[PDB]
Write a protein that binds this ligand. Structure first.
Ligand SMILES: Cc1cc2nc3c(=O)[nH]c(=O)nc-3n(C[C@H](O)[C@H](O)[C@H](O)COP(=O)(O)OP(=O)(O)OC[C@H]3O[C@@H](n4cnc5c(N)ncnc54)[C@H](O)[C@@H]3O)c2cc1C
Ligand SMILES: Cc1cc2nc3c(=O)[nH]c(=O)nc-3n(C[C@H](O)[C@H](O)[C@H](O)COP(=O)(O)OP(=O)(O)OC[C@H]3O[C@@H](n4cnc5c(N)ncnc54)[C@H](O)[C@@H]3O)c2cc1C
Ligand SMILES: [Cl-]
Ligand SMILES: [Cl-]
Ligand SMILES: [Zn+2]
Ligand SMILES: [Zn+2]
Lengths: 467, 467
């Protein structure tokens, strides 16, 4: 029997970052992955693939609609979908090799197979051929991640009634793509194919898109996506999804109770993500789940079995890749006798549409439900000289500040490069900065971040300069 | 003779922002501009025009070199140079109307003409036809800005031997553009026409481009610009620039003393910018200049005449647009009896090439010259999943931290979206953040700002995760 200090089950962003941090702290560490390659959901069927298709489709969007204005003379651009998907596949293969490299550099043992608990200290690793080996580990970090949710009445066929996994591998640009469900994934992949020529209709039970974010962002994102051609059927309860050859028929009822029928040639189900624990052998180690199917954890991400921890999508909190990464570093440093901290209020959330959407801190709805006295500052992206020069003019920056102390309580962005502008707000809130603090700091001109500076001026005293 | 509390000579970013900040504080404010429209250098012949052409030319670069890999099918793209410039002119016209809106909204009086001092309290405003009006102002803010520098043997002709002003309005894509000076302006305008098909040769007297920035950024920017097709003749002292019909011949000597000759059809002189005070009548008010031609200032940007202040490119400091803006707000708030402060160490500098370059704080060369014990952190952009997805893999993030306290002393970036990532570093240093602090803060995944977190991990304890 091989012996290790720490075992990590799952090779997603939480898993392999946790392993590296365990190796850096001196633990003999092993990581177990059932997939053929390392990287988890985010690399193989998640973040990296979506960003690659989003980047290529946005290039296609510019060529089709803005090149003439930009002074670039081309004929009607055409989509080579096989090259798009193939290039994305190479991007995934690139990142997988980098993760392999990191494992070797940190002297982490990598085992391919399904890891199941035999006890609180023994783990069975079953390879593809069915053979098994048992290893011993003093501590174990569960990082098994999540799987796509679905609806029980939908029969997924991996052809036309699909999830994000297959949607990233289409053999053609859909004529009419139907998106069932209000997950972020649906809006991102819908943007990809909307740009590539598809008709996209989002059919959703929820009353607004991205409802977990600030309401202004919900409003502005639907406003800009409609402007781009996406159609939205909100507050609509789907009751059926039929495949009839080359056609999918979605039947539902609207908020007034009337019947609704939507037909397309492709249907993507994006109704959320579900924690994944199948085959993990939790009963044999004694680890408890909650009513939602998540590994119960305490303040130290510890299960009821003291030597077993759990991180990432398999536990409570925002199901984000960098949230799993931070929790992995947290457990490793905790195992080393340190006292780390995670501020979950300061974990940003990003939507990778164009314009990008990003938020950190409290939403206005959260401040209202708590009876917090707050100020609002708001500056539009179209007023920036940088946006006029690039034609990326959609969106707004919104800052919430405590009315008495001026401390920034939440920053909510929709606009060009918001996925990276949000970092300024994260650092600002980490140092408990006031709106006045940010308003007085130099922001490079011309940049999109000047909208943050202007919004902070608006929040601190309604004294923005460029509005 | 009308009376005002504050008069502002110049409608640049410093000029008009100061006027707005003065109007917000309750002062009767008037602003004078000799140009036909408002905006100063940055709007009409500076930041906005160049940024517009950089965005258009980068699109053309993608269509020519990356669209096929992206899966976008087009024929060879062609340049409509008249349309490029026309759109840029429209962006300038857009922004000019916005400044007009801001002046009227803040109830600032706008006068067109040359502003000249009659005394420390009277200012003559001379229109083009010769008519004059004299105004009285308790205080005056000098914001007359800058002009392109040149060399005594250079005869500028506004056709083929040109400055930045004319290069932004070319009627054809150059066959071979010669750039004299490796400054921010020269590299940006060279990149514009390089992408559009021109051959670009940069001739620079110093041994490195952008020498006012960190040496790593100098090296990496030259490394990538060469990869993009730019040619560089460094350590080269130009001694003659003659126009011979449709061709310009630049004669110089290399580091070995051997003669060097470069021929092109367009020659851009980018040897820096010089403070502009022509016709301002400073002698009639008593305001003294320094040896370099700049309006002398003290701690409060005050001249020797106590009621007259000066800001922007006409005074000491980095000749940057947001530097003029901040100094305009500083003088305005100082006039109001408040006690503001400008931290010149925390004013970022941006080069809008692709990849973008940005730095803030001390350079490594400065830390060496001061004998500061420092740590270095460095993460490459090609290792980010986000960069792999977009194919924007060039560059590095470099963080300098104090060896004893771990406090970040400077952050230097070359990579995608550096123009907006630098904002995180500015806010970080403003709060005296340590390398460990940034390394522990949540960074959205996948984003380019993750390279900042990784570089901070490298600086704080050589413990980056993805390297
Ligand atoms: C299309 C899509 C786009 C997304 N885009 C983003 C985005 O832009 N940003 C973002 O932050 N998040 C995004 N996400 C979410 C992101 O993928 C997750 O939040 C993140 O991957 C969390 O991963 P993790 O480490 O907790 O586990 P996971 O990445 O979900 O994977 C855990 C791993 O455990 C392995 N495993 C499970 N059980 C066993 C077992 N018994 N034995 C061995 N191995 C096992 C699995 O094979 C899997 O590889 C996206 C998701 C999808 C699907
Ligand atoms: C091609 C180019 C690109 C640049 N890009 C950038 C960039 O990306 N970022 C950046 O920060 N900086 C950039 N700069 C520099 C930027 O333009 C200046 O730093 C900024 O404009 C500072 O302006 P200011 O208020 O100090 O004065 P200015 O904008 O230089 O001009 C003030 C105005 O005063 C007027 N004036 C002068 N004397 C008188 C008088 N006696 N009476 C009446 N009117 C008068 C002038 O006509 C002028 O319009 C760039 C410069 C150039 C040339
Ligand atoms: Cl602005
Ligand atoms: Cl990373
Ligand atoms: Zn500005
Ligand atoms: Zn990451």
């Amino acid at each position: 029997m091989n012996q290790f200090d720490v075992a990590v089950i799952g090779s997603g962003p939480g898993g392999y970052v946790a392993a590296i941090r365990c190796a850096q702290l001196g633990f003999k560490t092993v990581i177990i992955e059932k997939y053929s390659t390392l990287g988890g959901t985010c690399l193989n069927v998640g973040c990296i693939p979506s960003k690659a298709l989003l980047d290529s489709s946005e290039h296609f969007e510019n060529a089709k609609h803005t090149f003439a204005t930009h002074g670039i003379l081309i004929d009607e651009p055409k989509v080579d979908i096989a090259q798009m998907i193939s290039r994305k596949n190479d991007v995934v293969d690139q990142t997988t090799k980098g993760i392999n490299f990191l494992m070797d550099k940190n002297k982490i043992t990598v085992l391919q197979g399904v890891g199941s608990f035999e006890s609180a200290t023994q783990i069975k690793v079953t390879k593809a051929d069915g053979s098994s080996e048992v290893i011993e580990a003093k501590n174990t970090i569960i990082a098994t991640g999540s799987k796509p949710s679905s609806l029980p009445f939908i029969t997924l066929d991996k052809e036309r009634v699909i999830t994000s996994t297959e949607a990233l591998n289409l053999k053609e640009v859909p004529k009419h793509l139907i998106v069932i469900g209000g997950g972020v994934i649906g809006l991102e992949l819908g943007s990809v194919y909307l740009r590539l020529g598809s008709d996209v209709t989002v059919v959703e039970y929820l009353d607004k898109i991205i409802p977990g974010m600030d309401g202004t962002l919900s409003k502005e994102l639907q406003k800009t996506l409609k402007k781009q051609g996406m159609k939205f059927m909100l507050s609509t309860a789907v009751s059926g999804v039929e495949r009839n050859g080359d056609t999918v028929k979605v039947t539902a009822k609207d908020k007034k109770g009337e019947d609704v029928v939507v037909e397309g040639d492709y249907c993507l189900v994006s109704v959320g993500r579900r924690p994944y624990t199948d085959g993990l052998g939790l009963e044999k180690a004694g680890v408890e789940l909650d009513e939602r199917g998540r590994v119960k954890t305490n303040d130290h991400l510890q299960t009821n079995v003291p030597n077993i921890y759990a991180i990432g999508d398999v536990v409570k909190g925002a199901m984000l890749a960098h949230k799993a990464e931070e929790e992995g570093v947290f457990v490793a440093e905790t195992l080393a006798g340190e006292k780390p901290h995670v501020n979950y209020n300061l974990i940003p959330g990003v939507v990778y549409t164009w314009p990008e959407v990003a938020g950190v801190g409290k939403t206005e709805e959260q401040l209202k439900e708590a009876g917090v006295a707050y100020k609002t500052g708001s500056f539009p992206m179209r007023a920036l000289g940088r946006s006029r020069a690039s034609m990326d003019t959609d969106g707004v920056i919104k800052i919430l500040a405590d009315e008495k102390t001026d401390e920034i309580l939440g920053v909510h962005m929709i606009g060009a490069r918001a996925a990276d502008m949000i970092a300024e707000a994260v650092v600002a809130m980490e140092f408990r900065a006031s709106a006045e603090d940010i308003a007085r700091i130099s922001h490079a001109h011309p940049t999109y971040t000047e909208a943050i500076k202007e919004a902070a001026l608006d929040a601190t005293g309604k004294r923005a300069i460029h509005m």
